[PDB]
Amino acid sequence: SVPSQKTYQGSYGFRLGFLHSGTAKSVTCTYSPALNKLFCQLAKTCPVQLWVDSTPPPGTRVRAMAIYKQSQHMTEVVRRCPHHERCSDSDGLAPPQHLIRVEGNLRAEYLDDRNTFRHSVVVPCEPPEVGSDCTTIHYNYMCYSSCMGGMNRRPILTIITLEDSSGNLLGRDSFEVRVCACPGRDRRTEEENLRK
Ligand SMILES: CN(C)Cc1ccc2c(c1)c1ccccc1n2CC(F)(F)F
Ligand SMILES: [Zn+2]
C-alpha cells in the first residue's frame, strides 16, 4: 500500500543527476543537493538526468511516481486538486488527474494502477545523444504543493524507477519536490533553515 523509496543503484549503477540552475528570483526549476529537493514552478520544464555505469537491455523503461513524504499521509494517492483536474489543460496523452507529466515524448505511457489506484508515467529508456554522457527526461508538475483539496501543503517525493520490460525493479532513486511560485527564494530559505 506504500511504494518503496529505498535508493538502489542495481546492476547498471543507476542514479539521477540535476543541473546547477542557481537560486535567482527568476529561476523556474532548481535542485538542492543539501536537501535532496527539487523546487519548481507550476507546469514548467524540470530536467532530470539519468546516469548508468553500464547499458541496460532493450525494453528497459523509466517510471516516475509521486508519494506523500509524511508517513501519516503515505497511503493517500497523490493527485491533482479539484480545480486543476478540471481545467482542461490536457496535452492529449496525460490523464487530467495525473500530477506528473513527461514533456515531449510521444512514447510516454500513463498508468492508473488497478490495485493501488496510484498514478505514474513511464517512458522507454533511450541512450544519450552522441556527445552526451547521460539521458535527460523533462518532467512537469501540474499542481502547486499548496493546492487546496490536493497536495494541500503536504510535501511529496518523486520516485524514479528503472524497470525491465515486465516492470521488475532494476534501480531506484528519489527526491523531494516543492511546486511553488518562487523556487529560487524557497530553496534559499530552506537551505538557510537547514544550516541554522
Ligand atoms: C554508460 N554511460 C556512460 C552512458 C549512458 C548513460 C545513460 C544511459 C545509457 C548510457 C543508456 C544506454 C542504453 C539505454 C539507456 C541508457 N541510458 C539511460 C539510463 F541511464 F539508463 F536511464
Ligand atoms: Zn492544483
Curated annotation (Swiss-Prot):
Result for mutant: residue 164 to E: In sporadic cancers; somatic mutation
Reported effect, residue 66 to T: In sporadic cancers; somatic mutation
Impact when changing residue 80 to Q: In a sporadic cancer; somatic mutation
Record note on what altering residue 128 to H does: In sporadic cancers; somatic mutation
Outcome of swapping residue 154 to I: In a sporadic cancer; somatic mutation
Reported impact of residue 102 to G: In sporadic cancers; somatic mutation
Compartments where found: Cytoplasm; Nucleus; Nucleus, PML body; Endoplasmic reticulum
Effect in UniProt of substituting residue 43 to S: In LFS; germline mutation
Outcome when changing residue 64 to P: In sporadic cancers; somatic mutation
Impact after mutating residue 62 to A: In sporadic cancers; somatic mutation
Effect after changing residue 166 to R: In sporadic cancers; somatic mutation
Effect of substituting residue 109 to K: In sporadic cancers; somatic mutation
Mutagenesis / variant outcome for changing residue 45 to S: In sporadic cancers; somatic mutation
Name the UniProt record assigns to this protein: Cellular tumor antigen p53
